[model samples]
Target: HPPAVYLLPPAREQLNESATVTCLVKGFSPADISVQWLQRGQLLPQEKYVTSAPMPEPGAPGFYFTHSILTVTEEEWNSGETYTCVVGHEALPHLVTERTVDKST
Candidate 1:
């Protein structure tokens, strides 16, 4: 099955400071997946970010969950530019999710 993707906004305290953009990919199978971070359509290095090892989905056999995070400076976070989370999996073939930091709050 296709993975369910989510881009979670930074915490309130993280606003206007160094912020962490988190992406969650869930319910994917086979555990051979790729998660990537992108800014302005450019691929980001995996070493520059954090990614979790695949974890078994609770109560679900053969399903898994993975998380990735990208950290940005306050200026970058407030720039109103879109950041993307691209997921590659044999099950889905192509998956992409994106979000911009909402500073209105």
Candidate 2:
């Protein structure tokens, strides 16, 4: 199946003066996946992108998953800028799936 990504609540909307953007992802495999979080195609240095694969799940084999968080002020979030959450599988050799979102309405 094609990989999928989801942006947690309050998607594509106005942000209050003090708002943070958090991206959550799931449904992947093998635990060796590379997840990247980017703002306008540029990597974010201060934040962490984590993979939670090889996670123990009942009645199924383990798979890769991840999440990332970015805190931005209302002005930055209001720019209608796009952020990307990428899921890369090294085992496949240069295969990646990404999701793009603009917080501003």
Candidate 3:
């Protein structure tokens, strides 16, 4: 298909008061892949930021693979944050698209 794409918490919405900022994703292949946590176009891989991944999907057209969970905070989530999840699978690495979530929405 068209480079399988998806987003978690799927759209811009507010985070639950007790919930941590999180981004869940699927359909990632091409393992050299990298997912970066961003806020306002800046990279922030701090201790507060957390990420996890599950086993790769099958029938995946490529050799690389991944499934991921990215977490942030309620405060940061409410600060109009836009996180970029990137994947590096080719010459033009991190070519994967971005999913922006605005919790205030």
Candidate 4:
């Protein structure tokens, strides 16, 4: 099956501060994956993001989990720009992605 992806926005307590977005990619086979963060659909610089190694699920062979973390400045976060999480996996030829934006008033 294709991998499942999720987007987690900044925590409510950190609402007025800097933002750290979380992208959790899970449930796939072949054990090969890559995760990245994008701003306005363009790749964000390495300084702004980090992706952990793909971890195998306990007792579930061939499946994996990963965390794609993206951190941004308060100014950027409050601008209502889009943040996207993209995951590439061997299970599929293409890619899977999740996106979120801070809707402004």
TM-score of decoy 4: 0.82
Q: Candidate 2 local accuracy as lDDT? A: 0.60
TM-score winner between 2 and 3, please give it.
2
Clash numbers, per candidate = 0, 2, 5, 0
What are the root-mean-square deviations of the candidates from the true structure over C-alphas?
2.6, 3.6, 4.2, 2.6
Ten contiguous residues minimizing lDDT sum, candidate 1: 96-105
Candidate 3 local distance difference test against the native: 0.51
* Candidate 4 residue-wise lDDT, 1-105, digit = tens: 567887887765646556788888878776687777788888888888888887997666778877888899877877788888877776675655465555341
Clashes, model 2: 2
The residue ranges of model 1 lying beyond 4 angstroms of the native Cα positions read 14-16, 93-105
Summing lDDT over every window of 10 consecutive residues in candidate 3, give the lowest-scoring window.
1-10
C-alpha local distance difference test of each model? 0.75, 0.60, 0.51, 0.76
Q: Whose lDDT is higher: candidate 2's or candidate 4's? A: 4
Clashes in model 2: which pairs?
28-64, 29-64
| Model 2 C-alpha lDDT per residue in residues 1-105, reported as the tens digit of each score | 223467653354555565465566555555556667777898866543344443533444554445656666677667777877776765545588777777642
**Models sorted by lDDT, best on top:** 4, 1, 2, 3
Per-candidate TM equals 0.82, 0.65, 0.58, 0.82
